[PDB]
Amino acid sequence: SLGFLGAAGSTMGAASMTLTVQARNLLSHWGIKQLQARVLAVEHYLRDQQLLGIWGCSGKLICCTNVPWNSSWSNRNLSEIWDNMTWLQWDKEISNYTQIIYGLLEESQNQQEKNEQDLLALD
Amino acid sequence: SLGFLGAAGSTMGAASMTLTVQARNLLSHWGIKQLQARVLAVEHYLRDQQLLGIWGCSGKLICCTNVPWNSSWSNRNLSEIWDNMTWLQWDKEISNYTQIIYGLLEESQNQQEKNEQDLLALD
Amino acid sequence: SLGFLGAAGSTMGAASMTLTVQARNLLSHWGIKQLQARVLAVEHYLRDQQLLGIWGCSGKLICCTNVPWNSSWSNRNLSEIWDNMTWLQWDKEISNYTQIIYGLLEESQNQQEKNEQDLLALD
Amino acid sequence: NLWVTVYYGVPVWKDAETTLFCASDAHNVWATHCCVPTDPNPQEIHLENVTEEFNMWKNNMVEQMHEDIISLWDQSLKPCVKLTPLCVTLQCTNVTNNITDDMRGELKNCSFNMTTELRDKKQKVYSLFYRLDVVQINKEYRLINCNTSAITQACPKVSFEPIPIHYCAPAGFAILKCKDKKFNGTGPCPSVSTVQCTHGIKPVVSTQLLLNGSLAEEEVIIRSENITNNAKNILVQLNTPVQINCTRPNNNTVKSIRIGPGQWFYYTGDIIGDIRQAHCNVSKATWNETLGKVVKQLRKHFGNNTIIRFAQSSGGDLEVTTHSFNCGGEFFYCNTSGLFNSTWISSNDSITLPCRIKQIINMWQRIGQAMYAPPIQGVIRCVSNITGLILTRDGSTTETFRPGGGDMRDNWRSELYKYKVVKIEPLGVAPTRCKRRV
Amino acid sequence: NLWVTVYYGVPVWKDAETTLFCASDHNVWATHCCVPTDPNPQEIHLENVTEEFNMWKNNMVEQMHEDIISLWDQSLKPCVKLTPLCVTLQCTNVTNNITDDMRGELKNCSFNMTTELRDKKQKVYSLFYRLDVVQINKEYRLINCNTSAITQACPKVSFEPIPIHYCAPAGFAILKCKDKKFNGTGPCPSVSTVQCTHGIKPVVSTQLLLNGSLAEEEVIIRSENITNNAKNILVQLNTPVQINCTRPNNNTVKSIRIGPGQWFYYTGDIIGDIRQAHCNVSKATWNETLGKVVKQLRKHFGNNTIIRFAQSSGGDLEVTTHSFNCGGEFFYCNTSGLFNSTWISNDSITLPCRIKQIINMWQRIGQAMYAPPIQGVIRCVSNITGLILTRDGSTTETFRPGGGDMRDNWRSELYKYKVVKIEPLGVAPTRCKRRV
Amino acid sequence: NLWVTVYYGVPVWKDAETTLFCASDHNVWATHCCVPTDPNPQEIHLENVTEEFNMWKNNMVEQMHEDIISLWDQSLKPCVKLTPLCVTLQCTNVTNNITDDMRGELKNCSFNMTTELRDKKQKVYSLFYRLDVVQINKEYRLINCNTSAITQACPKVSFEPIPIHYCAPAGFAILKCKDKKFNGTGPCPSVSTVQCTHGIKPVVSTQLLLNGSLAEEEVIIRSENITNNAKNILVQLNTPVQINCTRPNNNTVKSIRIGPGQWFYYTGDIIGDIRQAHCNVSKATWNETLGKVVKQLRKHFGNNTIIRFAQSSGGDLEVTTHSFNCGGEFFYCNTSGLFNSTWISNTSNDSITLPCRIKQIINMWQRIGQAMYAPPIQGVIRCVSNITGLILTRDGGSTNSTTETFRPGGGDMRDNWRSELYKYKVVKIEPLGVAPTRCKRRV
Ligand SMILES: *[C@@H]1O[C@H](CO)[C@@H](O[C@@H]2O[C@H](CO)[C@@H](O[C@@H]3O[C@H](CO[C@H]4O[C@H](CO)[C@@H](O)[C@H](O)[C@@H]4O)[C@@H](O)[C@H](O[C@H]4O[C@H](CO)[C@@H](O)[C@H](O)[C@@H]4O)[C@@H]3O)[C@H](O)[C@H]2NC(C)=O)[C@H](O)[C@H]1NC(C)=O
Ligand SMILES: *[C@@H]1O[C@H](CO)[C@@H](O[C@@H]2O[C@H](CO)[C@@H](O[C@@H]3O[C@H](CO[C@H]4O[C@H](CO)[C@@H](O)[C@H](O)[C@@H]4O)[C@@H](O)[C@H](O[C@H]4O[C@H](CO)[C@@H](O)[C@H](O)[C@@H]4O)[C@@H]3O)[C@H](O)[C@H]2NC(C)=O)[C@H](O)[C@H]1NC(C)=O
Ligand SMILES: *[C@@H]1O[C@H](CO)[C@@H](O[C@@H]2O[C@H](CO)[C@@H](O)[C@H](O)[C@H]2NC(C)=O)[C@H](O)[C@H]1NC(C)=O
Ligand SMILES: *[C@@H]1O[C@H](CO)[C@@H](O[C@@H]2O[C@H](CO)[C@@H](O)[C@H](O)[C@H]2NC(C)=O)[C@H](O)[C@H]1NC(C)=O
Ligand SMILES: *[C@@H]1O[C@H](CO)[C@@H](O[C@@H]2O[C@H](CO)[C@@H](O)[C@H](O)[C@H]2NC(C)=O)[C@H](O)[C@H]1NC(C)=O
Ligand SMILES: *[C@@H]1O[C@H](CO)[C@@H](O[C@@H]2O[C@H](CO)[C@@H](O)[C@H](O)[C@H]2NC(C)=O)[C@H](O)[C@H]1NC(C)=O
Ligand SMILES: *[C@@H]1O[C@H](CO)[C@@H](O[C@@H]2O[C@H](CO)[C@@H](O)[C@H](O)[C@H]2NC(C)=O)[C@H](O)[C@H]1NC(C)=O
Ligand SMILES: *[C@@H]1O[C@H](CO)[C@@H](O[C@@H]2O[C@H](CO)[C@@H](O)[C@H](O)[C@H]2NC(C)=O)[C@H](O)[C@H]1NC(C)=O
Ligand SMILES: *[C@@H]1O[C@H](CO)[C@@H](O)[C@H](O)[C@H]1NC(C)=O
Ligand SMILES: *[C@@H]1O[C@H](CO)[C@@H](O)[C@H](O)[C@H]1NC(C)=O
Ligand SMILES: *[C@@H]1O[C@H](CO)[C@@H](O)[C@H](O)[C@H]1NC(C)=O
Ligand SMILES: *[C@@H]1O[C@H](CO)[C@@H](O)[C@H](O)[C@H]1NC(C)=O
Ligand SMILES: *[C@@H]1O[C@H](CO)[C@@H](O)[C@H](O)[C@H]1NC(C)=O
């Protein structure tokens, strides 16, 4: 019971056990400022949900994919990443490669939408 | 079709077969009252969809879970619950304990996801 | 690649390989016109997502369903549909049967959910 | 051996407060262009085996109707001429040339120095006034509003005629309607239905009698929050309209002067023919039958051996003590003592109610915002249906009832009592024998 | 044995109407109110897509019309209301420095105006351009005193047209017609998709279209129904005609306080000779341009048919002359000298111009603007990129300058664009079934 | 060997800007527009999180500034417009019941005012302070006649600050610095997350900051750039200094109509002696306060530097005096008695009395064209407040000499806000991210 972002600063492998706590708080002229803010909260939420959708991770807090990890992005050990490191630090270390990884996640899912359809057609 | 709320008053069993009808009718200074009405409808929709997602019931109208039912919450016979009572009555009886059940559902899903990740890593 | 709607005019088969190109661009007094524009985009996005959810196609780009195709809607050969026609043409051709098909898809998923619940209860 | 199962799309609801929007249907002060026209095909869903509790005395649909009406009224006047140049000394004499005793001393003939299109020029004009709008200063008079407010002239091209407004719930909400013909506004209603929009409601403004509303289906219905408490008003819904014919027999000629660049003032120039009072005609027998029915229903709450007496209003502002309404665009103040003068104990003969007319109107019981109702050229006649009453009971063996009123929310409750707004709560949980497979 | 398969992200669209917003990269068009735009906008060519456009039913035009009017009014809302000026004026003629062309054009008016203190008055003497002053019966009033109020335009706000880009909301797209020789009504074989239009300058003019786009190859004549004499003809040129407009008089501008921080601007005097404002075009350039127009009209009306041009037949100054905003001054130029000709199978043209300070723009009544005079001498150089012509209701067709409806200036730039809604969801048969 | 795994709900964030709304808990801070506060706000301490804060680049301050200006204008907008008042005034000196300080300070004016009827006039006489009236050539006009219009503030609307809590929208959070002795520009070793700020009272003042937060441990000296002679220094005090302000004169307030529904308020008369408004500061407390300030300034300027305090160099009253709103009246107090000392090597019930001027025509926020008339208040006014911080400017004398001089500064309202909003920054929550794991997706 750490609270919202109470795990920040904690080891990545430990902080990953409280994902629900942050996830459930993302949707939590003077009236226009409020109305605009409400709209933004929705827009940001939906953009992240759309990415999970196109990557095939809809409905999950933890999603495994078939994009292999490239040592170019990071050559750190799992005992150095999931332990002896927090998420704020990790985000900075691989900030460059975020766009690349996202592109690959999308490509992979689109290929697997096609492969599934072909198998069903063969059945 | 009985119409949008036509199933109300029928037994829970009978009403469980019309879920599509009620679900599809969600989402569907004077311009501010109209925008507020629109924004509010969206926010409520998304908040309920978020809970279903957190609990693992993503994109489904009926979900079975791994949380056992406690006789403390209600000890009625299933034949009474499904054949005599309607949903309005049921909800009033269990207005209490709603947040116990919801908390358990969030916990159960988090554990399930962790376990699936471990099996995939081992396989 | 081709860019947004760059596949328009291509055959349906070829065009189907660019679905993520269009999907990512669906979501993203004076200042009120700006809010209305934002709200409207969200509403359209969500209505399509809700509909996919009802049909059991949540999170998918290519969703196979169990509603059979009727010759009364269109009786073309598959090679004609997928290799000669484009999507703009197809949409015009079967415009009259859109609601029929959608109604059938909703009914089919409701039956599928009922069947799953009974099987799990029987186990 | 049971498991928790989650169901989405569950047909349940909770009482809730939300903001409604108007739809109306397809120039007028009701600004219906600001509403979104509804679907020509309405839907109503009867809910079989559903009983629900309604409470018309705690209904926020009423509060919203009130606020939107006030707001549109004010918005309508925003682009209209401000008659600030009229707060001048008026030099007035009596209109005596063609008067019957009916209006002796009621009309005044006033002369004054009015502004013109050019800043450096003045004009002398004269006009007729109805006395109720003019007060003596010391023959020197001023308009009644000079020491409290500015007056905005109503725009001559915009009608005040009520247009039915349909109020619609936002998605995620629903409006439940009570179909019980004997329902008195409070408690369980055995037969209900669901609608998305209300019937059209005409925003008729009146003070003692309710005009052009809905009629009760079977019997006169007495509704109150607590009938026991004489501090509350009683709303009465009738089973038959009582037809009332109202008129201003005088033929007014309307003149217009320029008062500034792009602005003009409208006023009564003269009167053609003789001068007689405005009045309303109510058939006596129909009124007597109607009132007798009201008495029978009142006896059900006060006792069969209690005498019921009707009396005229005892005092208060003219807006409260008389029956005030907008007839043809003019504002009438009718004396109803001729309708409520009878004690009830265990051939074209009509009742005539004299009516006075005012041009400077202070609506919605507010101070600081007056409206000038420009005169309407010609002779005015309007016919309307009395569909209900607002009565107030006094504090022995005899009870006394008088016309009550003055609070506009009561006029609304009489149409909105049938509806309540609820929130739809589609997500629910119940035990089943289905265990998730993992 | 085929089953319905649902596809999401399908490249399909429908004709649609939505709200568009601006992205326009001290100015009346309030570009600070627009979003910043894309430094490098994308365009996608829709190879093998043919789509229909109809410029006369394009609601983008109607929205531009509404936005332009609202922006205009918003810039005037916070400016001083010149109501103390609606007084009797004592006026005499300015005959001190007149050429024969200016005889009776300017008047010297004296009046008693308000000042900072309510108690005091001041005598003011200003010059007017006659068209703004109407005789009362040497007693005159400003023309607007019976119908409207005057708002002084703020001296700090420029009226110079600045390009405005219109952008569609997500879920919508703007199709653009890339075909040359496209007249605006019918199939367009080469189209592309953009999110925002190119910038359009909101230039206000009445007979000649100024500073617009040029036709790619040849004069294009567009109309809703060319054989219907009730319709206007919009002619797009493929070459500019350069026009030089001048107000040669050197104005000295004075100002007074008329109220509590309120001030009025007016012409005090004029240095040197007063001459009429005028516009110049080359005769040869104009004759070549007009000949091209004639050739294209001939294709539509027939060979060995006489094509005649004539001056506008009548109506208000705003439609009988070519009006425009030059340096902030409002000119009303006589184009008869351009359109006086008959066509059958160094040396310039000078057009006289009048100037007004009280402006009733967008054909509205009750809202009038006062344009402060500008100190100094003004010259503008602009390109004529099109014409608005009407066809006179035999063996001879007669064309006259037309105009008066601002929607037409808009259409000349927006004819290439259409708004559609994206419909990403759809179905088709295929040999695929869902496992149960 | 390793695969990309996507996580949602990851506890990370980025610097970000957004629009904050107010939550509150007859004023000019539209507290009725604001939503209510959370009776049980949740402050979450973040263990092992170091976050960099910069109070000088904090846009919360800019947003508060704009909100205050807009709220101010909205509350004034519907009130009576005193344009009938810009008339020639005939004025003489008040000589009856005058002490020596108030000599020529107060004037007795008469004028021809309008009435409800357009045809009539009334002769009204009111008292005005000499700061509001400027001579025309005994002929005077109000100071605003040649630059602005006057709106009378509505008598029913207070000017007493009500705490405002700013709240982030969902998707955003506010990080708070709990590091005591935080100078406001630097990494903060101990932080917590809140959704709403504490309640900040939008107190308006110039040279001395009133009714703010106190430093937890010791006086804190903060500036954008301490070595830049062009920057102001914000000093947060450890203990409050109590200041007692009053206007002893018993004003009788009169009201007339100047048009239909338009009431004008003015001072009619004064009962008894006419004395100068003033503020009292405990002498001993003030002397201890400066000694503490000096010890801290030395950390930046050295021991061998003499620290001298001096009065403001000059300018408009709004920047040379201590301005504040007391009881609804506007005071301009001359703080020369507070900043007249030299500290070399850091060297009862007495008090310092500061004379104050009263002004009714107010031009706030350093704007031109929008002027307000503050109605006089019936009766005698006294208010007690806490000095919680100072704004100082610096004459960089130590560069050339052994003596450094500090003077009262301020006047830019943004600096008053920075005083409270230095502990907070807005960040955007970024719930998505990836990391390598051993997990793969079954096909
Ligand atoms: C209870 O409900 C009744 C309706 O049943 C209301 O009575 C109506 O009141 C309106 C005015 O508010 C009357 O409308 C006026 O009627 C005049 C006569 O109409 C005849 O001639 C026209 C052709 O010219 C026919 O179409 C029509 O059927 C009649 O045969 C018109 O001349 C008036 O138009 C002029 O004035 C209006 C002012 O708003 C302008 O906008 C117009 O442009 C024009 O200058 C107008 O239409 C209506 O006739 C009345 N009906 C009846 C049956 O009497 C009651 O008022 C209502 N009760 C309450 C309290 O509101
Ligand atoms: C720093 O912080 C301090 C507080 O810690 C502020 O001081 C307060 O200032 C307000 C406003 O001047 C004071 O409130 C006023 O008090 C008047 C005196 O009566 C009081 O005492 C009697 C007797 O016990 C009580 O019966 C009465 O209710 C009061 O408690 C009242 O007359 C005032 O009310 C009138 O004016 C207001 C205007 O807003 C109207 O709304 C009312 O209807 C009425 O006409 C008002 O209540 C308060 O007492 C002061 N507190 C203390 C402890 O002294 C400083 O002002 C602040 N510093 C700065 C710069 O803002
Ligand atoms: C902040 O850092 C400290 C030091 O590493 C963490 O404390 C350790 O926590 C683990 C897990 O509970 C214990 O097994 C160790 O014994 C603790 N170390 C010491 C020295 O006591 C602390 O958990 C971190 N905080 C957060 C929120 O992650
Ligand atoms: C209806 O109004 C009456 C009158 O106020 C209420 O009865 C009173 O109740 C109080 C206690 O709350 C007693 O002290 C009074 O003596 C009672 N007066 C009378 C005349 O009985 C009554 O409770 C109200 N009923 C409802 C449903 O609100
Ligand atoms: C109100 O006016 C209506 C007419 O507008 C009256 O109805 C008329 O009644 C007389 C009675 O003899 C009949 O001759 C007429 O034919 C009726 N007219 C219509 C329209 O049917 C009605 O009686 C009047 N009521 C009162 C009490 O004034
Ligand atoms: C603009 O070009 C279109 C062709 O692209 C012309 O449309 C044709 O008009 C004729 C005569 O009415 C019809 O018979 C054809 O069927 C139309 N073709 C199409 C594709 O619609 C149009 O008339 C031209 N308009 C102008 C002003 O030049
Ligand atoms: C507030 O305190 C911090 C921490 O001591 C000061 O930060 C130093 O600033 C200098 C100049 O840019 C840098 O070279 C140092 O590296 C910073 N120190 C650290 C630990 O990062 C800051 O300057 C102080 N601000 C004021 C106004 O005194
Ligand atoms: C400011 O005013 C307060 C009163 O509001 C003074 O405090 C009082 O001091 C006397 C000293 O004899 C005590 O008996 C009272 O009990 C104190 N009252 C309160 C409420 O504390 C304070 O001394 C004044 N300060 C200055 C600088 O004038
Ligand atoms: C209401 O109850 C009757 C049995 O008395 C049943 O036949 C009917 O179907 C029920 N209505 C609904 C909506 O379930
Ligand atoms: C100014 O007013 C005086 C009267 O006070 C009048 O005689 C004079 O003609 C007016 N002057 C002008 C220019 O209107
Ligand atoms: C008011 O006092 C000042 C003091 O300097 C003096 O100069 C002035 O003449 C006095 N005015 C009157 C009217 O007494
Ligand atoms: C102040 O006025 C009073 C009368 O109200 C008088 O008795 C007293 O002497 C005057 N004091 C001074 C200093 O003028
Ligand atoms: C102020 O405090 C210092 C010590 O910090 C002391 O030496 C000095 O005498 C004090 N001054 C007064 C006036 O009390």
PDB file of N, CA and C in Angstrom, chain D residues 83-90 92 110 112 127-137 140-149 151 265 359-360 372, chain F residues 116-117 260:
ATOM      1  N   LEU D  83     -33.383  51.691 -23.305  1.00  0.00           N
ATOM      2  CA  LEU D  83     -34.133  52.929 -23.264  1.00  0.00           C
ATOM      3  C   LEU D  83     -33.751  53.791 -22.098  1.00  0.00           C
ATOM      4  N   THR D  84     -32.474  54.025 -21.956  1.00  0.00           N
ATOM      5  CA  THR D  84     -32.011  54.840 -20.870  1.00  0.00           C
ATOM      6  C   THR D  84     -32.417  56.294 -21.045  1.00  0.00           C
ATOM      7  N   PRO D  85     -32.504  56.860 -22.269  1.00  0.00           N
ATOM      8  CA  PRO D  85     -32.914  58.209 -22.505  1.00  0.00           C
ATOM      9  C   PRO D  85     -34.342  58.483 -22.075  1.00  0.00           C
ATOM     10  N   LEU D  86     -35.160  57.455 -21.793  1.00  0.00           N
ATOM     11  CA  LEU D  86     -36.531  57.739 -21.366  1.00  0.00           C
ATOM     12  C   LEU D  86     -36.719  58.087 -19.907  1.00  0.00           C
ATOM     13  N   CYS D  87     -35.680  57.982 -19.047  1.00  0.00           N
ATOM     14  CA  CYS D  87     -35.860  58.290 -17.638  1.00  0.00           C
ATOM     15  C   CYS D  87     -35.731  59.803 -17.470  1.00  0.00           C
ATOM     16  N   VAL D  88     -36.823  60.463 -17.813  1.00  0.00           N
ATOM     17  CA  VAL D  88     -36.956  61.911 -17.856  1.00  0.00           C
ATOM     18  C   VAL D  88     -38.168  62.349 -17.120  1.00  0.00           C
ATOM     19  N   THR D  89     -38.277  63.635 -16.873  1.00  0.00           N
ATOM     20  CA  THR D  89     -39.500  64.095 -16.274  1.00  0.00           C
ATOM     21  C   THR D  89     -40.555  64.083 -17.357  1.00  0.00           C
ATOM     22  N   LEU D  90     -41.691  63.501 -17.067  1.00  0.00           N
ATOM     23  CA  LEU D  90     -42.784  63.463 -17.999  1.00  0.00           C
ATOM     24  C   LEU D  90     -43.828  64.437 -17.525  1.00  0.00           C
ATOM     25  N   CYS D  92     -47.628  64.993 -17.651  1.00  0.00           N
ATOM     26  CA  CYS D  92     -48.781  64.169 -18.004  1.00  0.00           C
ATOM     27  C   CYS D  92     -50.110  64.765 -17.565  1.00  0.00           C
ATOM     28  N   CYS D 110     -48.664  61.665 -21.806  1.00  0.00           N
ATOM     29  CA  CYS D 110     -47.407  62.276 -21.350  1.00  0.00           C
ATOM     30  C   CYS D 110     -46.546  62.861 -22.460  1.00  0.00           C
ATOM     31  N   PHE D 112     -42.734  64.708 -23.416  1.00  0.00           N
ATOM     32  CA  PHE D 112     -41.346  64.803 -22.966  1.00  0.00           C
ATOM     33  C   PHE D 112     -40.313  65.153 -24.056  1.00  0.00           C
ATOM     34  N   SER D 127     -46.740  60.329 -25.738  1.00  0.00           N
ATOM     35  CA  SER D 127     -47.217  58.965 -25.805  1.00  0.00           C
ATOM     36  C   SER D 127     -48.206  58.633 -24.716  1.00  0.00           C
ATOM     37  N   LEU D 128     -48.894  57.517 -24.878  1.00  0.00           N
ATOM     38  CA  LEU D 128     -49.820  57.125 -23.835  1.00  0.00           C
ATOM     39  C   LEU D 128     -49.251  56.025 -22.945  1.00  0.00           C
ATOM     40  N   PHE D 129     -49.566  56.120 -21.667  1.00  0.00           N
ATOM     41  CA  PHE D 129     -49.145  55.166 -20.654  1.00  0.00           C
ATOM     42  C   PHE D 129     -50.320  54.629 -19.863  1.00  0.00           C
ATOM     43  N   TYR D 130     -50.134  53.473 -19.237  1.00  0.00           N
ATOM     44  CA  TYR D 130     -51.195  52.790 -18.487  1.00  0.00           C
ATOM     45  C   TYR D 130     -51.259  52.999 -16.988  1.00  0.00           C
ATOM     46  N   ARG D 131     -50.600  54.023 -16.467  1.00  0.00           N
ATOM     47  CA  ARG D 131     -50.593  54.369 -15.033  1.00  0.00           C
ATOM     48  C   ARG D 131     -49.785  53.442 -14.163  1.00  0.00           C
ATOM     49  N   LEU D 132     -49.945  52.158 -14.308  1.00  0.00           N
ATOM     50  CA  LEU D 132     -49.210  51.235 -13.478  1.00  0.00           C
ATOM     51  C   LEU D 132     -47.705  51.360 -13.713  1.00  0.00           C
ATOM     52  N   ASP D 133     -47.314  51.897 -14.861  1.00  0.00           N
ATOM     53  CA  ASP D 133     -45.925  52.090 -15.235  1.00  0.00           C
ATOM     54  C   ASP D 133     -45.360  53.467 -14.887  1.00  0.00           C
ATOM     55  N   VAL D 134     -46.190  54.361 -14.370  1.00  0.00           N
ATOM     56  CA  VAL D 134     -45.787  55.747 -14.154  1.00  0.00           C
ATOM     57  C   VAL D 134     -46.058  56.236 -12.734  1.00  0.00           C
ATOM     58  N   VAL D 135     -45.074  56.857 -12.103  1.00  0.00           N
ATOM     59  CA  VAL D 135     -45.292  57.351 -10.753  1.00  0.00           C
ATOM     60  C   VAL D 135     -45.070  58.822 -10.635  1.00  0.00           C
ATOM     61  N   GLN D 136     -45.839  59.432  -9.763  1.00  0.00           N
ATOM     62  CA  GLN D 136     -45.775  60.861  -9.553  1.00  0.00           C
ATOM     63  C   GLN D 136     -44.527  61.242  -8.809  1.00  0.00           C
ATOM     64  N   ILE D 137     -43.894  62.324  -9.241  1.00  0.00           N
ATOM     65  CA  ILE D 137     -42.682  62.826  -8.600  1.00  0.00           C
ATOM     66  C   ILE D 137     -42.947  63.750  -7.403  1.00  0.00           C
ATOM     67  N   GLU D 140     -46.045  66.166 -12.827  1.00  0.00           N
ATOM     68  CA  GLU D 140     -44.717  65.615 -13.152  1.00  0.00           C
ATOM     69  C   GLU D 140     -44.554  64.210 -12.642  1.00  0.00           C
ATOM     70  N   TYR D 141     -44.270  63.335 -13.587  1.00  0.00           N
ATOM     71  CA  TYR D 141     -44.140  61.902 -13.420  1.00  0.00           C
ATOM     72  C   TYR D 141     -42.842  61.338 -13.960  1.00  0.00           C
ATOM     73  N   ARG D 142     -42.479  60.169 -13.492  1.00  0.00           N
ATOM     74  CA  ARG D 142     -41.324  59.448 -13.997  1.00  0.00           C
ATOM     75  C   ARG D 142     -41.716  58.018 -14.220  1.00  0.00           C
ATOM     76  N   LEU D 143     -40.943  57.277 -14.975  1.00  0.00           N
ATOM     77  CA  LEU D 143     -41.293  55.883 -15.136  1.00  0.00           C
ATOM     78  C   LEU D 143     -40.977  55.148 -13.856  1.00  0.00           C
ATOM     79  N   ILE D 144     -41.762  54.124 -13.563  1.00  0.00           N
ATOM     80  CA  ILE D 144     -41.606  53.350 -12.337  1.00  0.00           C
ATOM     81  C   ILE D 144     -40.227  52.774 -12.093  1.00  0.00           C
ATOM     82  N   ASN D 145     -39.519  52.399 -13.124  1.00  0.00           N
ATOM     83  CA  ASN D 145     -38.199  51.812 -12.963  1.00  0.00           C
ATOM     84  C   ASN D 145     -37.013  52.771 -12.739  1.00  0.00           C
ATOM     85  N   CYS D 146     -37.196  54.114 -12.781  1.00  0.00           N
ATOM     86  CA  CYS D 146     -36.078  55.068 -12.704  1.00  0.00           C
ATOM     87  C   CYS D 146     -35.232  54.963 -11.459  1.00  0.00           C
ATOM     88  N   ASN D 147     -35.794  54.580 -10.349  1.00  0.00           N
ATOM     89  CA  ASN D 147     -34.964  54.511  -9.159  1.00  0.00           C
ATOM     90  C   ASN D 147     -34.447  53.094  -8.829  1.00  0.00           C
ATOM     91  N   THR D 148     -34.668  52.064  -9.709  1.00  0.00           N
ATOM     92  CA  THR D 148     -34.197  50.687  -9.470  1.00  0.00           C
ATOM     93  C   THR D 148     -33.471  50.023 -10.639  1.00  0.00           C
ATOM     94  N   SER D 149     -33.786  50.377 -11.881  1.00  0.00           N
ATOM     95  CA  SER D 149     -33.232  49.641 -13.008  1.00  0.00           C
ATOM     96  C   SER D 149     -33.221  50.339 -14.353  1.00  0.00           C
ATOM     97  N   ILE D 151     -34.128  49.933 -18.466  1.00  0.00           N
ATOM     98  CA  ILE D 151     -35.135  49.162 -19.175  1.00  0.00           C
ATOM     99  C   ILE D 151     -34.654  48.795 -20.562  1.00  0.00           C
ATOM    100  N   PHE D 265     -37.683  53.689 -30.619  1.00  0.00           N
ATOM    101  CA  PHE D 265     -38.626  53.414 -29.556  1.00  0.00           C
ATOM    102  C   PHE D 265     -40.041  53.309 -30.064  1.00  0.00           C
ATOM    103  N   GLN D 359     -46.694  47.834 -19.227  1.00  0.00           N
ATOM    104  CA  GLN D 359     -45.628  47.746 -20.206  1.00  0.00           C
ATOM    105  C   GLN D 359     -44.252  47.565 -19.597  1.00  0.00           C
ATOM    106  N   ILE D 360     -44.033  47.986 -18.354  1.00  0.00           N
ATOM    107  CA  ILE D 360     -42.701  47.810 -17.797  1.00  0.00           C
ATOM    108  C   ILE D 360     -42.756  46.619 -16.886  1.00  0.00           C
ATOM    109  N   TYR D 372     -39.155  46.621 -21.446  1.00  0.00           N
ATOM    110  CA  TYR D 372     -40.261  47.395 -21.968  1.00  0.00           C
ATOM    111  C   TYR D 372     -40.947  46.589 -23.027  1.00  0.00           C
TER     112      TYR D 372
ATOM    113  N   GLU F 116     -30.978  60.139 -11.234  1.00  0.00           N
ATOM    114  CA  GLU F 116     -31.710  59.097 -11.944  1.00  0.00           C
ATOM    115  C   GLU F 116     -32.318  59.644 -13.207  1.00  0.00           C
ATOM    116  N   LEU F 117     -32.896  60.830 -13.101  1.00  0.00           N
ATOM    117  CA  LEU F 117     -33.499  61.449 -14.254  1.00  0.00           C
ATOM    118  C   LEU F 117     -32.416  62.141 -15.046  1.00  0.00           C
ATOM    119  N   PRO F 260     -30.185  55.433 -13.036  1.00  0.00           N
ATOM    120  CA  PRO F 260     -31.061  54.376 -12.604  1.00  0.00           C
ATOM    121  C   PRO F 260     -30.284  53.167 -12.172  1.00  0.00           C
TER     122      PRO F 260
END
